[PDB]
A paper describes a structure:
However, in the structure of the LIG1/nick DNA duplex containing an A:C mismatch, we showed that the ligase active site exhibited the LIG1-adenylate conformation, where the active side lysine residue (K568) was covalently bound to the AMP phosphate. This refers to step 1 of the ligation reaction. Our results indicate that LIG1 stays in its initial adenylated state and cannot move forward with subsequent adenyl group transfer to the 5′-P on the downstream strand to activate the ligase for attack by the upstream 3′-OH of the nick DNA. These observations suggest that the A:C base pair imparts the active site conformation that suppresses the further chemical steps of catalysis. The distances between the ends of the nick DNA for A:T and G:T were 2.1 Å and 2.8 Å, respectively. In the LIG1/A:C structure, the 3′-OH of the nick DNA was rotated 50° from that of LIG1/A:T. The overlay of both structures demonstrated significant differences in the conformations of the 5′-strand due to clear shifts in the positions of the −1G, −2T, and −3C nucleotides relative to the upstream DNA. Moreover, the position of phenylalanine (Phe) at 872 (F872), which is located upstream of the nick and positioned close to the deoxyribose moiety of the nucleotide at the 5′-end, shows an important difference between the LIG1/A:T and A:C structures. Notably, superimposition of the structures in placement of the wobble A:C mismatch and the cognate A:T base pair at the active site of LIG1 demonstrated the shift in the position of F872. The interaction interface between R874 and the −2T nucleotide of the downstream DNA showed a change in the LIG1/A:T versus A:C structures. On the other hand, LIG1 discriminates against A:C mismatch with a large distortion of 3′-OH and 5′-P ends at the nick.
DNA ligase I (LIG1) catalyzes the ligation of the nick repair intermediate after gap filling by DNA polymerase (pol) β during downstream steps of the base excision repair (BER) pathway. The downstream steps of the BER pathway involve DNA synthesis by DNA polymerase (pol) β and subsequent nick sealing by DNA ligase I (LIG1) or IIIα to complete the repair of small single-base DNA lesions. In the present study, we defined the molecular basis of the human LIG1 mismatch discrimination mechanism via moderate resolution structures of LIG1/nick DNA duplexes containing A:C and G:T mismatches at the 3′-strand. We observed the C3′-endo pucker in the LIG1/A:T structure while the LIG1/G:T and LIG1/A:C mismatch structures exhibited the C4′-exo sugar pucker. In addition, similar to the previously reported LIG1 structures, LIG1 containing the DNA binding (DBD), adenylation (AdD), and oligonucleotide binding (OBD) domains completely encircles the nick DNA containing the cognate or mismatched ends.
Numbering used by the authors: 261 to 387, 391 to 750, 752 to 901
Amino acid sequence: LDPSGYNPAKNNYHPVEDACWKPGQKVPYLAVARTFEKIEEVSARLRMVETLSNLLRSVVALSPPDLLPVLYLSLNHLGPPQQGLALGVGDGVLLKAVAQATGRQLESVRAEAAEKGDVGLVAENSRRLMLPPPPLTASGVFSKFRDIARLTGSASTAKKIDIIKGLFVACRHSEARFIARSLSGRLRLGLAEQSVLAALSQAVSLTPPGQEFPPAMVDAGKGKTAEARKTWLEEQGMILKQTFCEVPDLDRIIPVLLEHGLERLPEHCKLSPGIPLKPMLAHPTRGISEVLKRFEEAAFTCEYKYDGQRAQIHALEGGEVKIFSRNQADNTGKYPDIISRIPKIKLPSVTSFILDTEAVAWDREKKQIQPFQVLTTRKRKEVDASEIQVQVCLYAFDLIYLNGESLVREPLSRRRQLLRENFVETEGEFVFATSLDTKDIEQIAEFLEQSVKDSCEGLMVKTLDVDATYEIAKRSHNWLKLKKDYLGVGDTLDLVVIGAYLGRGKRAGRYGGFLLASYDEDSEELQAICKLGTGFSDEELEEHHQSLKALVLPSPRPYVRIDGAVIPDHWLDPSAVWEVKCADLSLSPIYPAARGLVDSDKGISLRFPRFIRVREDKQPEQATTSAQVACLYRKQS
DNA sequence: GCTGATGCGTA
DNA sequence: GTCGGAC
DNA sequence: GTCCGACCACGCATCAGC
């Protein structure tokens, strides 16, 4: 019963006979590290989910109290999202911790990190007393995380490091690697919230919980054919997934799960205001072409695409209001002005609601929307409604809860109707999305032109009646986003490659990204405008490594200016011209491209740049000019 | 008390 | 946001 | 088509080091 050889990958896995801790005992972390180890070793999701489910099966069998930590460890989360825990541990610290844990120089082990592309294997390969401290447990290592996440104030980083040295010198075998990876936030397991859910639902279904030990019922799949066992699990699979969608808070599910069992969960775990839900999202479309096929025979509506923050507004019985972002973080304290205007936006009939809206930066003096970059300069922290400098206008466009009742399983027509009926527009505080419902291949295209005129990113397009319900389990991108840059219309740039960046794991070794530049005629310089790491195939990314290998330089050219950009690992004789696409342009505090052209102190950078195509026809001389770029940014009114 | 390095969470 | 890998 | 882990600018909050 040694865990150094534990194996949930095994075949005909017996939850008890194959475990590596006697029952009731605390689950070793090495089990987890092993599980993780056997997961990282295949690449097929369907294997990975069973191998996790094996660990879970045992955990449910022997040590039920450790189920929650084990799941949180596998998610690399610290707890429910709306509590806002955060490690506050970076690569910088994590390293200091490793260096102190082993001996070497900070820049020594730092070097080992940036050319292995992963701290986890810097951690463990490095050689911690004559005594091995007693071995790490999953409950403990979880609770050492939260301990790191609670420390704050002066000299908090010291204490943070100090716990990490502990964990490390107590690590055996591969633990020091997955511990290092979790704390760096890049667990990069291969399975996420979805698969962990798949594995958990397989595990309680295979090895049902609450059994008096030893459990009579170990594999509850035995009496079934393959076809039977498979669509059985998928069924239970969808029980857990959907229920979690409505209530995505493990600390409340896992108890209930354990007591009344999986199939009865959806009657104790009701969608309720006060718990942040993951919002519904969409999918791009090439144009009003791809529209009429995905939607086919179903009336749709058309809504403005708003360049703001999605905010999801919860209203309990008894007046407590809380406001949540799309990541389920609590944003209430961030928005006191909206907590105050609540009574002015509901009919006093309304006792409880959940609203799907989009907070946009709004100018009062001129009655017009300001772009997202302005909005981002709100204070996050505990505000006082007095000192708001950047007003915000809410754009409500759906309804999930109304007076005790969940509207999830009901069509958008209905959902919009009740929203139109119980809530009240007040211009530049709270309105409905500017809309149209219509099907004409032309008047739609006229409405987009008018939206993008209004300082909006494009058009949302939502089915009114067919499939137009909200349930984000069976799908979670079920409307369509008609942009302008998804279209031949989208305005690209041709920019110059002036350096390269070494990659991180899954791209460590090869070039991970590039720093690009625009040509400034007046000073004759190349000014770095942004970095680029998105959207070349692995093969194209070596086409580049082989066509830039000749051009590596030890020093920048003198006519290249990057200001406070990240220094490339490999500077590059300036030769390669790529076609780059971006959503919008922005006023950069660190990029010199076109500085002074549009603002006394800030050049311009690209939000969300992706690489499209190389341009062999263009020399660095014919790329986009900083003059042209300044003109581009202005064209965003 | 301030500043630079950076973690985190908006896009 | 949108990407490619690998199923 | 789905899931996963990447990539990016930017600004507020936080803390070590001065």
